Amino acid sequence: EDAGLVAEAEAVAAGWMLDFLCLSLCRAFRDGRSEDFRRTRNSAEAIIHGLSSLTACQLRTIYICQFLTRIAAGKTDERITPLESALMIWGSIEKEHDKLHEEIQNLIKIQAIAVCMENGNFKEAEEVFERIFFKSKLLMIISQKDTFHSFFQHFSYNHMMEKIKSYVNYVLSEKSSTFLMKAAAKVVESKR
Amino acid sequence: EDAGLVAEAEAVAAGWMLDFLCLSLCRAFRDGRSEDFRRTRNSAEAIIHGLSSLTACQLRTIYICQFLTRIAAGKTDERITPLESALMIWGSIEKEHDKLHEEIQNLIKIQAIAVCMENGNFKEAEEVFERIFFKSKLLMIISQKDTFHSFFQHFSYNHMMEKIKSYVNYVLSEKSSTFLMKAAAKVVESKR
Numbered sequence: 001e002d003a004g005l006v007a008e009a010e011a012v013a014a015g016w017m018l019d020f021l022c023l024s025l026c027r028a029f030r031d032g033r034s035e036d037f038r039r040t041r042n043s044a045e046a047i048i049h050g051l052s053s054l055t056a057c058q059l060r061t062i063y064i065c066q067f068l069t070r071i072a073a074g075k076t077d078e079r080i081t082p083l084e085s086a087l088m089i090w091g092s093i094e095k096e097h098d099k100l101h102e103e104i105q106n107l108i109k110i111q112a113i114a115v116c117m118e119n120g121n122f123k124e125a126e127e128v129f130e131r132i133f134f135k136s137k138l139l140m141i142i143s144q145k146d147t148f149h150s151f152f153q154h155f156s157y158n159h160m161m162e163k164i165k166s167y168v169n170y171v172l173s174e175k176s177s178t179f180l181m182k183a184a185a186k187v188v189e190s191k192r
Numbered sequence: 193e194d195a196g197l198v199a200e201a202e203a204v205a206a207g208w209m210l211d212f213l214c215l216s217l218c219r220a221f222r223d224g225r226s227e228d229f230r231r232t233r234n235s236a237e238a239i240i241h242g243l244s245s246l247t248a249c250q251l252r253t254i255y256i257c258q259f260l261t262r263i264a265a266g267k268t269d270e271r272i273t274p275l276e277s278a279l280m281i282w283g284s285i286e287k288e289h290d291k292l293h294e295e296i297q298n299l300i301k302i303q304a305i306a307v308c309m310e311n312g313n314f315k316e317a318e319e320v321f322e323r324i325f326f327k328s329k330l331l332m333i334i335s336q337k338d339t340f341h342s343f344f345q346h347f348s349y350n351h352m353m354e355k356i357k358s359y360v361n362y363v364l365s366e367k368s369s370t371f372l373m374k375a376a377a378k379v380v381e382s383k384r
């Protein structure tokens with residue numbers, strides 16, 4: 001057997017497993033299946049370690065998985081919070097900076113502060129605010145522990161999750177026809 | 193979309209990834225590619241967590257992966273050593289207890305003691321001997337620190353690895369035609 005051709009076959013299969021796990025991670029995030037999300041994340045993380053050279057499409061795929069992982073840990077190496085880490089990934093992914101992108105970006109920025117206030121760590125909320133950043137007014141709300149200010153109700157966790165879920169639906173539609181899931185669905189429908 | 197049919201497709205794909213990773217784990221073990229073995233082991237471990245109901249064939253596959261994992265850690269939750277743990281898996285796998293099975297079993301039993309002596313932990317070598325187990329003579333060799341006794345040279349680490357590698361070749365031939373690797377090799381050969 002040719003060691004090089006066998007390794008190339010393993011690289012193609014890793015690429016297929018990556019797309020399958022991204023599609024599965026997107027569905028568990030959309031459905032709110034936390035444990036399924038956690039397991040798929042662990043599998044995608046292990047599969048990703050098996051690849052050493054990635055295409056532009058594959059880099060986009062791993063960064064989406066990393067982004068959703070930090071978003072999922074939002075209320076739960078580096079000295080920043082998971083939502084601040086999601087913000088750094090979001091601003092660097094090779095993607096269009098459209099209306100939805102700006103909406104998701106601004107919701108994460110405000111929710112990174114609000115989740116600290118929700119947990120009762122207001123010194124952390126000010127530290128998060130200082131790393132990310134109107135500014136005087138946002139700093140006053142944190143100082144007065146106004147967690148339920150109308151500003152926070154308009155830029156809520158639920159609104160952040162709904163906007164991110166609309167983005168996940170475009171990724172899900174784009175990867176719904178990948179090799180591994182398409183082959184699996186055919187087997188399932190044949191039985192039946 | 194039907195959540196049940198989507199979950200069934202994910203179960204079929206997990207079954208395909210399991211066979212692919214077992215075949216890849218077998219090749220890295222045969223070739224002595226330690227880092228590739230470690231990465232594939234981590235991927236198989238994560239993929240296995242995603243399955244909750246396994247067929248008899250799939251249980252045989254995960255136990256082979258567990259067995260090779262303990263063999264690979266032989267010289268490196270539970271209060272026993274990795275080779276003693278490999279011995280427990282080996283004796284419980286649904287497989288024929290043929291000449292090769294007994295050979296591998298007896299080589300692991302003796303190497304579980306010899307690797308402790310090689311590392312200079314002779315109290316551990318006696319503790320391993322007591323958990324597994326002629327017996328008076330084997331206990332004398334450990335007591336006299338005769339790590340290079342002709343008995344240990346006939347039942348060596350290299351002989352243990354060669355016999356296990358012959359078994360791995362039968363597993364490798366049996367799983368060489370699984371769906372994921374067969375589809376990947378076709379893509380590679382088409383390019384070339």
Ligand SMILES: O=C(NC1CC1)c1cnn2cccnc12
Binds near residue numbers: 042044045066
């Ligand atoms: O970014 C992460 N994973 C990427 C593939 C989705 C990631 C970060 N922490 N973590 C812990 C366990 C598993 N995966 C992770």
Ligand SMILES: O=C(NC1CC1)c1cnn2cccnc12
Binds near residue numbers: 234240
């Ligand atoms: O038995 C194990 N894995 C099975 C799939 C091969 C196993 C034992 N320790 N460990 C650590 C990291 C990854 N996998 C493991």
